[PDB]
Design a protein around this nucleic acid. Structure first.
Lengths: 51, 741
RNA sequence: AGUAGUAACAAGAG
RNA sequence: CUCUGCU
């Protein structure tokens, strides 16, 4: 989380190289969900170690 | 600038850098799924190399059998199982002539081994097929099940403790018209009893279980290995004993010797060939394995070799030695788990057992399996495929190398009767053969003669992966000889790292492995220090035993930190307790407990070395301060390590996955057996150190020992009148319990 | 999907 | 709802 707090250049993610046999929206949603989870962890005061 | 590690060989000779050609850092290729396909392929391939043999139908088991012995002589270089009885007998006769009395002395040594060998010897060995359960069981468990079944069937001639008596019971069992076994079915536990007819028991006594060799390196394709039943192993032990006794008397047979004994024997023999060769004679050395060696070593030829070796011996000895080849010649191969069928449209799985391949429709299989099933269907009987020819992963390695060395000795100038001659080294399917001849044409003629003679005896040299060069450099069983054996450290890399016995045994084993590699595999001192550092780091991470002063967080960190604060002399702490690592090149041979003893705190020393701690558990002496290690190549090795038994010498959890299977009862029985044995040790402390003897039941021995011990303790005053009275009354109560039942 | 490769996992048994 | 992670 601290390392992610070190780069301030993120932005809305977009699929540039599609996965031919995969479902690209699923990967985009996975990244968005991870970002949401880590943000909820940051703004949260509880101490989940193995989120 | 394209870096190319292989270009290093342009300067460093291949052998001196052979370690680079071993990817052993990576994981070995494992086998996924069933081995039924591999077993079917092996059976079909073995029957293909002998197709020109004679087809018969066994009158006892009823299965078709193929006899390639004295078949048409080979007409092509492909592997062939048509061994000639006359040629093998001639090879054995010439081996006897060149080594007078070898067979006689070996036979007498086997006679004494047979006399003095007990049934408990069969406990050694692992993954022995248990005919009573149709699955692989530990050798001791399978032996116990077979003995119990024999006792329940009236075969009560095995209590003498002699292996030969057990073999007599084995034959008596096969000759019985019927058998009774006990099997558990859960639907609630039901100890059902199953009745086996004569033919079914015969088939299941000759059955050979098959599986897939896992973690096998150097082969792209997986192969199937087999383990025998309990009936076979008894005769196999004696056969191997005789063959090993013969091998020890052969200069060219290096199989019985192992490790540095193997390397020294091979070096001496190759040196002798280089010495006795004439200076003007052109010398060449051939390196090669034998293609389909196991598939072509027919058991009838092994019977012929045994009968020749046991010439003039007592008829009973001939019987004991010849039974195993007979049974193997009529052996059967279990297919295995079966296959797995999937339905994508309906999205479901299923596992089809191998026993129902003799009837299932062929549309469910892919082409390769379709043809393998079609080809093997004639040999299928009661879920097993008849495999009379060949030797599917045979354990007659000793006998096979005897045959190979006999053919190898056939190259003496008194036998070749030509300018050229040959010698070399044989071990299982591997051989390194040196040819001496005046000119290259002589070398070629000798090579052809040896190859054709091997074809005659059934040994098929692998022209695909064998090559000839000038004498001086060669390869033999993954040992690379370049004018002298060179150390190949990559072989011992998998041994490094945490062994996984326990904290103490694993530290001792790691330091001992580093030390042994320094001594043998030319592990330099700086690299030894590297290996020590990396092993300590891996050990700490695996055992969550980082130093207390560190901030690393783990579920064991709190206790280690408290202990670190508690101790006054930090240096005395073991690495398993967050102590520093005091090891180095100097003291790799010293156990950590003894190394840090003077530095240990008194209270910590007492707690760590408290004999009454519950973590330490001691089994029989044979399983003390020793471990089983599996090298990248070769069979299991028994490595002994120097370790002081401390609280860290605990036992890891035992796999409980048998608790939710129909066969949990065996586990329960094991528990109870241990409950009895540990009490017997409570009455007879020396039972663990040396095996006890007697014919009386355990209860009788224990109660008599208790009574006498009570009387002696009273006389010495160690116990009072009331204690002696209670002990006597309890003994009388035990007697009454035994009587009433 | 993916791992993987001659047969499997992508939980299994009650 | 319980059991198993080499059986």
């Amino acid at each position: 989380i601290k390392c992610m707090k070190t780069f301030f250049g993120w932005k809305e993610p977009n699929i540039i190289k599609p996965h031919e046999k995969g479902i690209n929206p699923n990967y985009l949603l996975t990244w968005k969900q991870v970002l949401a989870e880590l943000q909820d962890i940051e703004n949260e005061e509880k101490i989940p170690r193995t989120k | 600038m394209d870096v190319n590690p292989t270009l290093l060989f342009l300067k460093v000779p291949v052998q001196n850098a052979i370690s680079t050609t071993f990817p052993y850092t990576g994981d070995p290729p494992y086998s996924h799924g069933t081995g039924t396909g591999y077993t079917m392929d092996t059976v079909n391939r073995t029957h293909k190399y002998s197709e020109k043999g004679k087809w018969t139908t066994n009158t006892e088991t009823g299965a078709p059998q193929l006899n390639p012995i004295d078949g048409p002589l080979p007409e092509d270089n492909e592997p062939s199982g048509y061994a000639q009885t006359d040629c093998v007998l001639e090879a054995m006769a010439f081996l006897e002539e060149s080594h007078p009395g070898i067979f006689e002395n070996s036979c007498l040594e086997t006679m004494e081994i047979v006399q003095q060998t007990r049934v408990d010897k069969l406990t050694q060995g692992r993954q022995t097929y248990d005919w009573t359960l149709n699955r692989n069981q530990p050798a001791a468990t399978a032996l116990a099940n077979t003995i119990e079944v024999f006792r329940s069937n009236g075969l009560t001639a095995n209590e003498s403790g002699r292996l030969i008596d057990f073999l007599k019971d084995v034959m008596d069992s096969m000759d019985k018209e019927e058998m009774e076994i006990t099997t558990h079915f859960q639907r609630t536990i039901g100890k059902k009893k199953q009745r086996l007819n004569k033919r079914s028991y015969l088939i299941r006594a000759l059955t050979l279980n098959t599986m897939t060799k896992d973690a096998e390196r150097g082969k792209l394709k997986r192969r199937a290995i087999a383990t025998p039943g309990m009936q076979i192993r008894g005769f196999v032990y004696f056969v191997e004993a005789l063959a090993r006794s013969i091998c020890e008397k052969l200069e060219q047979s290096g199989l019985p010797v192992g490790g540095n004994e193997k390397k020294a024997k091979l070096a001496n023999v190759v040196r002798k060939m280089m010495t006795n060769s004439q200076d003007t004679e052109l010398s060449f050395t051939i390196t090669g394995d034998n293609t389909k060696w196991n598939e072509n070593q027919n058991p009838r030829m092994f019977l012929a070799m045994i009968t020749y070796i046991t010439r003039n011996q007592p008829e009973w000895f001939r019987n004991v030695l010849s039974i195993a080849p007979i049974m193997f010649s009529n052996k059967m191969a279990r297919l295995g788990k079966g296959y797995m069928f999937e339905s994508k449209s309906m999205k479901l799985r299923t596992q089809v057992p191998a026993e129902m391949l003799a009837n299932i429709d062929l549309k469910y299989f892919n082409k390769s399996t379709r043809e393998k099933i079609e080809k093997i269907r004639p040999l299928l009987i009661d879920g097993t495929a008849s495999l009379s020819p060949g030797m599917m992963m045979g354990m007659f390695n000793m006998l096979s190398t005897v045959l190979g060395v006999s053919i190898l000795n056939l190259g003496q100038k008194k036998y070749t009767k030509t300018t050229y001659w040959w010698d070399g080294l044989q071990s299982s399917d591997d051989f390194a053969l040196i040819v001496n001849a005046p000119n290259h044409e002589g070398i070629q003629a000798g090579v052809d003669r040896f190859y054709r003679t091997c074809k005659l005896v059934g040994i098929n040299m692998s022209k695909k992966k064998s090559y000839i060069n000038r004498t001086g450099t060669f390869e033999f069983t993954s040992f690379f000889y370049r004018y002298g054996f060179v150390a190949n450290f990559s072989m011992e890399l998998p041994s490094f790292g945490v062994s996984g016995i326990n904290e103490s045994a694993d530290m001792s084993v790691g330091v001992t492995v580093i030390k042994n590699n320094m001594i043998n595999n030319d592990l330099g001192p700086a690299t030894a220090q590297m290996a020590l550092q990396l092993f300590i780091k891996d050990y700490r991470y695996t055992y969550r035993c980082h130093r207390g002063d560190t901030q690393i967080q783990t579920r064991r960190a709190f206790e280690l930190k408290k202990l670190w604060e508690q101790t006054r002399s930090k240096a005395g702490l073991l690495v398993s307790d967050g102590g520093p690592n005091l090891y180095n090149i100097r003291n790799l041979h010293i156990p950590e407990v003894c190394l840090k003893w003077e530095l240990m705190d008194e209270d910590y020393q007492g707690r760590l070395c408290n004999p009454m701690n519950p973590f330490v558990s001691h089994k029989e002496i044979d399983s003390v301060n020793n471990a089983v290690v599996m090298p990248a190549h070769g069979p299991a090795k028994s490595m002994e390590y120097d370790a002081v038994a401390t609280t860290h010498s605990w036992i890891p959890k035992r796999n409980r996955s048998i608790l939710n299977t129909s066969q949990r009862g065996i586990l329960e029985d094991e528990q109870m057996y241990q409950k009895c044995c540990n009490l017997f040790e409570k009455f007879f402390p020396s039972s663990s150190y040396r095996r006890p003897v007697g014919i009386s039941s355990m209860v009788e021995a224990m109660v008599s020992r208790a009574r006498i011990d009570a009387r002696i303790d009273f006389e010495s005053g160690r116990i009072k009148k009331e204690e002696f009275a209670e002990i006597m009354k309890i003994c009388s109560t035990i007697e009454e319990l035994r009587r009433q039942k």
